[PDB]
Amino acid sequence: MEDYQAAEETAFVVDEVSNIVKEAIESAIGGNAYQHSKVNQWTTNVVEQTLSQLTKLGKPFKYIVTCVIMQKNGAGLHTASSCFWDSSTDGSCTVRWENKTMYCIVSAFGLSI
Amino acid sequence: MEDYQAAEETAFVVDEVSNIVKEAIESAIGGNAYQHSKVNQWTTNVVEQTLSQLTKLGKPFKYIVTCVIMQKNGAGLHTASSCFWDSSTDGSCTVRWENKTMYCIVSAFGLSI
Amino acid sequence: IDNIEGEWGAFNDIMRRKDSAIQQQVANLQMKIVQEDRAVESRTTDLLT
């Protein structure tokens, strides 16, 4: 019973990071509209809250958190990420998000030591 | 005196990675206008050319390349990237590029094992 | 329809991140399928005896 959650606490559990991403996004942005003066606070707060609760998982990883936040003005949103890791240990989380006024992509990573 | 050359052979120089990002952007994009069906292969070829030229260095790194390519429509753009690494060996590179029609942001990362 | 389209897009976004959390948790609960499977097998053999 103990080694299975020990295997959960050691490998890159991919989308509990996505729970940390949605808690970071729903803490930072909320249901607010696009005003550009708060976008730097929103990107910094999503990235700092995602680096806050990935460090409290206790997992030996190097974490990279990127976040793109986009105004809905008819401009359409494309990102990409291919990387170079060891495939059995590491992985990638990428969550898209939007509302009436804003777009959001947060891509999050974990790289083993 | 061999320890300084051994430290230089595994350091993350930001300028070489930025020149690899410049050559990958000017190899895949050029100066051609925004065609959204081509934005997928532009992001694919910039990430694959940056991952190709970064893995020709022979340095003991794990590399992450994320790319953002975006039409100039009067819409607003913030990208943020704080990470979690060993600060003595690892580093990052984030490059802003633009032409007449489009904004191209490439964030390139290198994390020692 | 601002509210219904916001609740429905929130239902689609939160439904897709729970689909991704399912796609993570099939591994963890697949070894819990293994755990509860030989638990039911061991308790099956014990209660048959």
Swiss-Prot record, chains A, B:
| MF terms in GO | dynein intermediate chain binding; identical protein binding
In terms of one coarse class, where is the protein primarily found?
Golgi
> Mind telling me which InterPro entries this protein's record contains?
Tctex-1-like, Tctex-1-like_sf
- Keywords on record: Acetylation, Cell cycle, Cell division, Cytoplasm, Cytoplasmic inwards viral transport, Cytoskeleton, Dynein, Golgi apparatus, Host-virus interaction, Microtubular inwards viral transport, Microtubule, Mitosis, Motor protein, Neurogenesis, Phosphoprotein, Transport, Virus entry into host cell
Q: Report residue spans for region: Interaction with GNB1.
A: 41-113
Q: Which residues carry this modification: N-acetylmethionine?
A: M1
State the CDD domains in the record.
DLC-like_DYNLT1
Family of the protein in this entry: Belongs to the dynein light chain Tctex-type family.
Name this polypeptide is given: Dynein light chain Tctex-type 1
Q: Which organism is it from?
A: Homo sapiens
List the gene name.
DYNLT1
Curated annotation (Swiss-Prot), chain C:
Q: Which domain of life is it from?
A: Eukaryota
Question: List-wise, which residues carry Phosphoserine?
Answer: S20
Disulfide linkages recorded for this protein, renumbered to the chain, are none
Question: Where, subcellularly, is it found?
Answer: Cytoplasm, Cytoskeleton
User: Which medical condition is this protein associated with?
Assistant: Charcot-Marie-Tooth disease, axonal, type 2O: An axonal form of Charcot-Marie-Tooth disease, a disorder of the peripheral nervous system, characterized by progressive weakness and atrophy, initially of the peroneal muscles and later of the distal muscles of the arms. Charcot-Marie-Tooth disease is classified in two main groups on the basis of electrophysiologic properties and histopathology: primary peripheral demyelinating neuropathies (designated CMT1 when they are dominantly inherited) and primary peripheral axonal neuropathies (CMT2). Cortical dysplasia, complex, with other brain malformations 13: An autosomal dominant disorder characterized by global developmental delay with impaired intellectual development. Some patients show signs of peripheral neuropathy, such as abnormal gait and hyporeflexia. CDCBM13 is associated with variable neuronal migration defects resulting in cortical malformations.
Q: What is known of its domains?
A: Dynein heavy chains probably consist of an N-terminal stem (which binds cargo and interacts with other dynein components), and the head or motor domain. The motor contains six tandemly-linked AAA domains in the head, which form a ring. A stalk-like structure (formed by two of the coiled coil domains) protrudes between AAA 4 and AAA 5 and terminates in a microtubule-binding site. A seventh domain may also contribute to this ring; it is not clear whether the N-terminus or the C-terminus forms this extra domain.
Q: Which family does it belong to?
A: Belongs to the dynein heavy chain family.
What's the stated role of this polypeptide? Cytoplasmic dynein 1 acts as a motor for the intracellular retrograde motility of vesicles and organelles along microtubules. Dynein has ATPase activity; the force-producing power stroke is thought to occur on release of ADP. Plays a role in mitotic spindle assembly and metaphase plate congression.
Quaternary data? Homodimer. The cytoplasmic dynein 1 complex consists of two catalytic heavy chains (HCs) and a number of non-catalytic subunits presented by intermediate chains (ICs), light intermediate chains (LICs) and light chains (LCs); the composition seems to vary in respect to the IC, LIC and LC composition. The heavy chain homodimer serves as a scaffold for the probable homodimeric assembly of the respective non-catalytic subunits. The ICs and LICs bind directly to the HC dimer and dynein LCs assemble on the IC dimer. Interacts with DYNC1LI1; DYNC1LI1 and DYNC1LI2 bind mutually exclusive to DYNC1H1.
Protein name (Swiss-Prot/TrEMBL): Cytoplasmic dynein 1 heavy chain 1
Q: What is the name of the gene encoding this protein?
A: DYNC1H1
Measured against the full-length protein, the chain present covers: 1211 to 1259 of 4646
